[PDB]
Amino acid sequence: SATMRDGLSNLARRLRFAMKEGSIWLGEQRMILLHTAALGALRKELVDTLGMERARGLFMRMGFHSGVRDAELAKTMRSGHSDFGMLEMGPCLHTIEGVVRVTPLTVDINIAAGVYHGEFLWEDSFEGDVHRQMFGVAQAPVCWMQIGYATGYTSALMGKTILYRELECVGCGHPHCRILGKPLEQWEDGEAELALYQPD
Template identity: 30%
Template structure:
């Protein structure tokens, strides 16, 4: 799924050139839908609202946070590996740019990079993302009502997993603002795990 020039030579794809309509491989005769080599599904977001409700029914808020965060982190790592293998970004910043680009195409929400600081030698990292229209905040409030703390745990896990894979660091992401608790947008702050925990 890399780009091809007039001489049929492959070159790395840029995130700005990504088009999910062209990237998806529809195989209804096999019951498959793929993005690169990764099988994907189309699912209504109401199912996520039901998942939130069931996680609370069988556990508590801590259990729900842990499950959703781990699920998100595994998904973020897998997606970052797929992007590297299939689209072959030419550098880390281009690789990073695919994360929010794909999220916007998927309908997850609209992420905007607010702060980025990275010094590999000093092991310093900070990524601050403002996120509009989070489907998780929407579904949480639909099913559970207003929240008193951030609830987009799956997105926080995804961002941590994706960035950890791209930059080869053990990163942790916290949601510091959330629409579900009345903030104007969701906000995610990613730093080395040692700084947060």
């Protein structure tokens, strides 16, 4: 809509169901369909036994790994795309994966120059949704794995550390989630946010 529409159709054709081998492929990566309620039960177990902040890191890093892999897929489809066209593939794959409906708001990107400032709308976040099913409204944003995805995708695409934060979140009782991504240097508590992406 309109680049989103082409993006979605372009990338949705890389998604493949190999039922003969019990497998689902997205580009070169094997995928599974997982119940959000099952992932939600795991999350509750982690939060109850390891604590909110350790569980938050576990999921952010899982999201990070997903993002890096989708960026590797986006790179194989470089041919004939602007830097924005390649960036947009992240929102599209996240949407195709059923994780969240992503709408890019303002995107400033130039990979060779190391330029990146990105704001995105998130609707129907599976994560904020299922977190609020189990813990009720939280006070801090809670789409941990989703934020990890954006951070991994964009960092892999730019070749430098790009961190994201939710400025608004359904898990906090907002109409929607809203995110901002920019280089580590432009974040007040940057090195504390980067620390979350390393194994504890």
